[PDB]
Scaffold this active site. Structure first.
Site, PDB file in Angstrom:
ATOM      1  CE  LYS D 162      -2.650   1.371   3.430  1.00 23.15           C
ATOM      2  NZ  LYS D 162      -3.733   0.991   4.319  1.00 23.15           N
ATOM      3  CE  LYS D 164      -0.050   6.098   5.097  1.00 24.31           C
ATOM      4  NZ  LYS D 164      -1.419   5.633   4.969  1.00 24.31           N
ATOM      5  CG  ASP D 193      -4.434   5.393   3.063  1.00 27.12           C
ATOM      6  OD1 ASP D 193      -5.299   6.275   3.010  1.00 27.12           O
ATOM      7  OD2 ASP D 193      -4.168   4.802   4.132  1.00 27.12           O
ATOM      8  CG  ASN D 195      -3.613   8.841   4.955  1.00 23.67           C
ATOM      9  OD1 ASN D 195      -2.780   8.271   4.257  1.00 23.67           O
ATOM     10  ND2 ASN D 195      -3.951   8.344   6.144  1.00 23.67           N
ATOM     11  CD  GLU D 219      -6.593   2.529   3.561  1.00 20.39           C
ATOM     12  OE1 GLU D 219      -6.106   1.592   2.915  1.00 20.39           O
ATOM     13  OE2 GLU D 219      -6.200   2.810   4.683  1.00 20.39           O
ATOM     14  CD  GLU D 245      -6.827   4.614   8.294  1.00 18.35           C
ATOM     15  OE1 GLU D 245      -6.500   4.023   7.248  1.00 18.35           O
ATOM     16  OE2 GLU D 245      -6.131   5.490   8.839  1.00 18.35           O
ATOM     17  CG  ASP D 268      -7.373   0.753  14.561  1.00 15.48           C
ATOM     18  OD1 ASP D 268      -7.557   0.690  15.765  1.00 15.48           O
ATOM     19  OD2 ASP D 268      -6.298   1.074  14.069  1.00 15.48           O
ATOM     20  CG  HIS D 295      -5.901   0.712  10.411  1.00 14.50           C
ATOM     21  ND1 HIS D 295      -5.803   1.558  11.442  1.00 14.50           N
ATOM     22  CD2 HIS D 295      -5.084   1.183   9.417  1.00 14.50           C
ATOM     23  CE1 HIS D 295      -4.946   2.506  11.112  1.00 14.50           C
ATOM     24  NE2 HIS D 295      -4.520   2.278   9.907  1.00 14.50           N
ATOM     25  CD  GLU D 315      -2.084  -1.244   7.665  1.00 17.27           C
ATOM     26  OE1 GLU D 315      -2.953  -1.130   8.539  1.00 17.27           O
ATOM     27  OE2 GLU D 315      -1.534  -0.274   7.147  1.00 17.27           O
TER      28      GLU D 315
HETATM   29 MN   LIG Z   1      -5.219   4.355   5.814  1.00 11.81          MN
END
Ligand SMILES: [Mn+2]
Ligand SMILES: [Mn+2]
Ligand SMILES: [Mn+2]
Ligand SMILES: [Mn+2]
Lengths: 357, 357, 357, 357
Positions: D162, D164, D193, D195, D219, D245, D268, D295, D315
């Site tokens: 993954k 970002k 991701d 975020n 994500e 998450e 999470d 997560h 993850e």
């Molecule tokens: Mn994330």
């Protein structure tokens, strides 16, 4: 040009007078965090946070003390500050105790901004100060003390009281409401608060019995996060379901109103995001057609409700009366905003020393 | 304590430079009503209203002159004033020209409040001044003039232009967009405005062809009051549908957003209800997740967008440049708020005399 | 072939007899704009507009005087004229005072078209003239005057009266309704109008108490633009919620009916768009299954309701009786269309001179 | 019979190796609270909490230290304990840092229950241990470091990484993804991701460009609490939107899934409510047809995913590798649960001393 130059917090556990018993537990004293926001202009903004339980008090103070570094030397601009805090706590979760802390900084920043411009907060928000009708909030007091406290509130000029119910039997709930009605007469408002203690079937059954008694509103009949369940209870009632003290931020209010969870709203100035969150909450209540009351923080709420288009009731529940001067007065059941810059909160410094944690 | 002591209006028909041709007609000069709100504190609030057509100009001035009696001797408190005007025009219809007049009084009252506190409006609203990216708004100019005006806007530092389209054939729309793209390169923003000229089938067909050309947004493809029709066009597009210049008050915005009519919004500071309506509109755009741009009134909009959580683009379309000082500057494509109390509007008094109606 | 050759307007402030007090203010005289539409055929169409408040009167006349240039030398074809005005005011906002002006021109153009063909308007629309039951509309008159006016309306043959309510207490509302019922008996219709004065919770509570008294309908219990809120109040009632006097154009009616805001409708011939808008409104009320009454303009409304498939009640509220001949008669509680070309409005020219503004 | 006899917490700030840069800020070290739950049976349950920012670390430890009094001498029964904590924090708000603390106690109570019965947690939950495919989670690393870290993860046997994204320009996002694809080949999974860094229009535009590159999932493209906005982005994509998450408790997951905010979920273990919340989350993901990944908390998550009917990916992001023994191994890209009672977390006690706060 005006900069935040420091943040000081003090944790106190202050006396109440009547302990707040609820169907889910009692709040016997008030754990408060007093906040002083110092600025480069030589004025100091003041606010306080309510921690609900002693268990969360030192954690909340610590959190505020560790956040001081990200706001010192920032411009005193509450809307810009709130956007920056929302972004910093992006990953951690901008809710719960972090959101409550960010809201204490907001309310102190707006008090400081009113002081810089030497004007009461309500006039900085663009509105005229006006008296706001207030109800006296009492607790799960049993028939005799609930009736005694209601007779006293009527003697002091209040035209409505809120009592807490959710006794083992529905008959006990009704006994409390009937005895208050008998004492105060048919014109008085009697709000009732279940404090999330019932499931949906039980809440439909008990609320329809209370509705036939004539109460003003039924507050948080079931779990506060269950907006769908509150919509299901409201759909069976003529009387309004009231909620909102537990919404953390305008975005939780927006979700509850979008599905029609309640006909009344009462945001908490701390949980909703301070003055910045309240202005946003007020705009949403106006479009959804929701009369909006306050929850606790009566000093800043008298200011915020005079600028709220659907303002409904102010809640009198004096948590901080022991450590602040009584500049907010109640005359004939209405709260009267003091003619002081900012919010009008002035610490009684030698009383604070007695309650310090 | 600060009271409104008078209201003065002047109707002018000012030169533009490039006449605004649209697919539904041309605005060849700007009919403006200049407003002076006098206060007991010796400061004077200033605002202007845009009448759109000469046909409505003297009517709008007359309306403002006949409204003066209900606001003189009222406290300078814009939120309280707006609630009182909403109630007075209850039966008549608080929309259209009456709402536009009430919004001119609001914008002048907030300019006066900034002057009383000697602070720029953005800082009175609780935010920091920041540069806001701006696009240059041009009109239905044909291929050669649209490309020339876009090359000039890029030379002045703007990174985006809006052109108006809705030519008899889709091929002409695309020719204009392609020629601009060729001149300014693939990085530049090209917004397009249909000015309500298409029906829904036609708008789906033309918008999907423009989407393959890569435009930034498609603005008011069909009749502005048809929110359902805009939702139907948006549902067939990846590119965002933009609208909002014609919403009269936050309550019309609330209806359009509730059914998902657009992915972007651009309220007009006058039609939305002035600063008071803009604060409410901003709170709604934040909860519905809508990036919010402005429509006209670039002087007050640079202030309002710095306090708007989803601020997106400022529209540069200088309607009043002939009669006001250039205190708003554009540097590298961004508008820079002047460091002046209130909004920063200062009349060029001997130019006004030339355009007076 | 028949062309519009001029437009003349006269602003008057005419006497009423009983001032119209409402829960949101009083209309003490009637500000009217009288319209004369001259044609190349030597006939003159007549209509009038109601301005609601003196504050808007000279603005509305000015607007009509400045619009004259776009309709002079146009064919006398009301449907084509309305489409052209909708397009001209595209950008400005085809609502509020502009829509009200366009509707005055429409009603005069249809009166002129009836005169060219020497036929009453109802027969030009393709329908037979028939008597339409009418109710007498009174105001917020207090118990003694509301009962006196209702006894007089029953003596004149009316079988229903509308009273305005929204007193500080619900008990006062009920006292007025009960005293009327006692005077006129259980067979008489008593409509009640709240004039947008309640919020949704208050409106549910008061309407369920009035429903147990047996009123015919409950009119505009809350803010007129809040269709969702009216749907929420209607969902709690057996009695019909009535609204529609404030819809500006059939497109606002379409939005309210689409979400089920009311079980009855009463469009205003001016705000709905004149005869052209009324024909469109009538087609929508028929498909949504809504009984349709009128709001003011009793002279043209007696014609329009005879061509309306769901025609329900005509409202008698004689705003212009001082300056027009009484050609509309009421016999046994029903309005009787005069046998005159067009609408049957004939000015009393020397009375007009007395009320001219 | 087995009772909780004490709670001990230690705050550490541990080294990571690669700092986690995201489009909204960087996590440069890991603030962890290590938890020891002592029981009357002589076994000690272990868990850790991740604080996200140093700013929240001492507050979270303090909160856990002040909560110790309500759980000491309670039966070691995690489901009963969680119901009692939910009720105690009823008024305060059972979310944010309080919910995260309650979840650390839950995960330690279940580790202790596995130790009392000498069985791995997955077998106490009623399931067989099985290898769970894992992806290696990297951060906003730029083209060269993102490609280097992906080649290393492929060399260690992982079949997916993954990265970002959310760079200033979409072109930079695509450059990172393309360079990874080129290095690792078309068979490798590349999750991305954002975020929460984009608004909805921007997220639709960027996600459709990434979808044409072939990424595994997208994500949290926008603000995590905006479930409606995620549903709007998902409706325009073939590729799955991933989120979860940030859900605090199964009740926030239930709201997001009820409106169709995402096609994948990744709760999470701390924010969802520990093992008790995970079992509830797993039952909801199964009925809504949502593949469920984890997560962080890879040690307990390898156990929880083997008992999850729609288990998807584990993850790998080793936050606590510095202070715990490497009993969780990764063989050929899959996590292998250790054959140890409870969760298999064993503190490296002399490393902890180095990082203590
Ligand atoms: Mn994330
Ligand atoms: Mn409560
Ligand atoms: Mn436009
Ligand atoms: Mn009415």
């Amino acid at each position: 040009e005006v900069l935040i130059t420091g943040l000081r917090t003090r944790a106190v556990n202050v006396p109440l007078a009547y302990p707040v018993h609820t169907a889910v537990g009692t709040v016997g004293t008030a754990p408060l965090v007093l906040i002083d926001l110092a600025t480069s202009a030589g004025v100091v903004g003041h606010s306080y946070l309510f921690a609900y339980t002693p268990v969360a008090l030192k954690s909340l103070k610590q959190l505020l003390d560790d956040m001081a570094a990200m706001i010192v030397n920032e411009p005193l601009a509450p809307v810009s500050l709130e956007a920056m805090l929302a972004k910093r706590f992006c990953l951690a979760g901008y809710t719960g105790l972090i959101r409550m802390a960010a809201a204490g900084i907001d309310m102190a920043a707006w008090d400081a901004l009113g002081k810089v411009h030497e004007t009461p907060l309500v006039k900085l928000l663009g509105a005229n100060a006006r008296p706001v009708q207030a109800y006296d909030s009492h607790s799960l007091d049993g028939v005799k003390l609930a009736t005694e406290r209601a007779v006293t509130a009527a003697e002091l000029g209040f035209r409505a009281v809120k009592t807490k119910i959710g006794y083992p039997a529905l008959d006990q709930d009704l006994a409390v409401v009937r005895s208050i009605r008998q004492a105060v007469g048919d014109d008085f408002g009697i709000m009732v608060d279940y404090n999330q203690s019932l499931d949906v079937p039980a809440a439909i059954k008990r609320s329809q019995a209370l509705q036939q008694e004539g109460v003003t509103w039924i507050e948080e009949p079931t779990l506060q996060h269950d907006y769908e369940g509150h919509q299901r209870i409201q759909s069976k009632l003529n009387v309004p379901v009231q909620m909102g003290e537990n919404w953390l931020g305008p975005e939780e209010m927006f979700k509850a109103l979008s599905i029609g969870a309640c006909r009344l709203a009462m945001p908490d100035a701390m949980k909703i995001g301070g003055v910045t969150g309240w202005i946003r909450a007020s705009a949403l209540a106006q479009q959804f057609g929701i009369p909006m009351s306050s929850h606790l923080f009566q000093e800043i709420s008298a200011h915020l409700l005079a600028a709220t288009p659907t303002a409904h009731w102010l809640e009198r529940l004096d948590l901080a009366g022991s450590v602040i001067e009584p500049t907010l007065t109640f005359e004939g059941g209405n709260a009267v905003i003091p003619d002081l810059p900012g919010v009008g909160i002035i610490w009684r410094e030698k009383e604070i020393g007695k309650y310090l944690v």
